[PDB]
Nucleic acid binder design. Structure first.
Ligand SMILES: Nc1ncnc2c1ncn2[C@H]1C[C@H](O)[C@@H](COP(=O)(O)OP(=O)(O)OP(=O)(O)O)O1
Ligand SMILES: [Ca+2]
Ligand code: NA
Length: 430
DNA sequence: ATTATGACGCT
DNA sequence: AGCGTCAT
């Protein structure tokens, strides 16, 4: 009743760039704009592996993880941009730098949590309160929400997409009580107005388009963002949750896309998020653990409390390379040469990071995979990172892994290594 | 022969 | 610590 929390205390948005690496390449090369195109890494093996796909190319069935040679079978006119290669490996610097451009703009509007290279959460609770004060009971015009969808509308008693969007928006605005500064639906709407402004600023100042979700927590905001892509934003209200969740496969909710989600489905014999409401909190904790059970109990009701953490910079800086099949490293010289290549890229990134961000990494983590192991990482060891020097880092990395060598011969390496990974961690202010 | 990342949970 | 899960 009156004491039942409804998880409507915050306004949270998730902003996510559309086909990000493709946009970065299209900005740089106008010949790729408005074309089916994709970004690929490496080229020798099957034309390279696709890592990003324009919406025009998606229409042909082109997807991430596809080999470009195979993508060309679906889309003969597909255009390709290659990830830069430095020191024998893919170098993602251009995309990281583009990400900083966007994150810096978002940070003008509110505190952000960097969630990935091209997405960030925003806690808009305070900004909304402020904007509500300026508005002073004044209604919100549809003109302020030119790219916003209201999930679940229109409903009740045009055949074009944009017509539908406007009908839903009108029904929503018609029902708003702008007289109540504490109305959660009103707070969400003002949140959406701010996100329109943020998205406009990103596009004006970078050229990049994005989508966004606006809701009361991170999980719903993330789910919302994907409902209308590309170049649109979606508002998911508390009230929209029962219908939305009633046919929402469990795997669509962030964190349920893997083994836990599969177990929820198997153990409970359900398919959709909404079906979770029929279990008690203790029942859910019994199957999935205290933490997961409480989380599920609240989440299936649209409630989640994970905060938007104030963190704009990555917490680790890493460099990794696979050596698949016949390329696996089988000699000590090979292993040392590649550790050096990685260490050199890492040094470059670390030095730039120290200058830009006034911090220093203090731990170096070294990870490898051995041929045969189904696991992505086979072994992880740490050592001290006391100097930003690639030769030292690579020597140190070799020292911590060298005993993994089964080979009786000093010069040979067995079993061959199929992955090397160096990661700088544990930053301290400097 | 997906690859290159990056955050967080468990013990 | 070192490993696993989940994600982009
Ligand atoms: N599995 C991956 N391997 C390598 N790079 C990836 C992978 N997934 C995503 N990326 C990179 C390239 C993407 O452009 C960027 C952002 O990813 P993501 O948001 O999932 O898709 P996207 O921005 O390309 O398309 P969308 O418009 O669907 O969001 O990160
Ligand atoms: Ca994206
Ligand atoms: Na993303």
């Amino acid at each position: 009743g009156p004491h039942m929390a409804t998880g409507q205390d915050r306004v949270v948005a998730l902003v996510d760039m559309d086909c990000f690496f493709v946009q970065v390449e299209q900005r740089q090369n106008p010949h790729l704009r408005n074309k089916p195109c994709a970004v690929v890494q490496y080229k020798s093996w099957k034309g390279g592996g696709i890592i990003a796909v324009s919406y025009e190319a998606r229409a042909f069935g082109v997807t991430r993880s596809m080999w470009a040679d195979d993508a060309k079978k679906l889309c003969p006119d597909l255009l390709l941009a290659q990830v830069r290669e430095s020191r024998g490996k893919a170098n993602l610097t251009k995309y990281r730098e583009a990400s900083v451009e966007v994150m810096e703009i978002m940070s003008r509007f509110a505190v952000i949590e960097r969630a990935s290279i091209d997405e960030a959460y925003v806690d808009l609770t305070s900004a909304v309160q402020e904007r509500l004060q300026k508005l002073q009971g004044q209604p919100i015009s549809a003109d302020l929400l030119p790219s916003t969808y209201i999930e679940g509308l229109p409903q009740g008693p045009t055949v074009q997409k944009e017509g539908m969007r406007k009908q839903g928006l009108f029904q929503w605005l018609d029902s708003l009580q702008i007289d109540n500064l504490t109305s959660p639906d009103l707070q969400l709407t003002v949140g959406a107005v701010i996100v329109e402004e943020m998205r406009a600023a990103i596009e004006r100042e970078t050229g990049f388009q994005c989508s966004a979700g606006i809701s009361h927590n991170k999980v719903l905001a993330k789910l919302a963002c994907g409902l209308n892509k590309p170049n649109r934003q979606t508002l998911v209200s508390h009230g929209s949750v029962p219908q939305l969740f009633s046919q929402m496969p469990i795997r669509k909710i962030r964190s349920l896309g893997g083994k836990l989600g599969a177990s929820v489905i198997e153990i409970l014999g359900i398919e959709y998020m909404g079906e979770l409401t029929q279990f008690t909190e203790s029942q859910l904790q019994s199957h999935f653990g205290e933490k997961n059970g409480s989380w599920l109990y609240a989440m299936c009701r649209g409630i989640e409390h994970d905060p938007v953490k104030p963190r704009q910079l990555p917490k680790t800086i890493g460099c990794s390379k696979n050596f698949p099949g016949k390329t696996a490293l089988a000699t000590r010289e090979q292993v040392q040469w590649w550790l050096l290549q990685l260490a050199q890229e890492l040094e470059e990134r670390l030095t730039k990071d120290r200058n830009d961000n006034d911090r220093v990494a203090t731990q170096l983590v070294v990870s490898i995979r051995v041929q045969g192991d189904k696991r992505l990482s086979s072994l992880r060891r740490c050592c001290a990172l006391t100097r930003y020097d690639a030769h030292k880092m690579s020597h140190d990395a070799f020292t911590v892994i060298k005993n993994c060598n089964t080979s009786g011969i000093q010069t040979e390496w067995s079993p061959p290594l199929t992955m090397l990974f160096l990661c700088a961690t544990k930053f301290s202010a400097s």
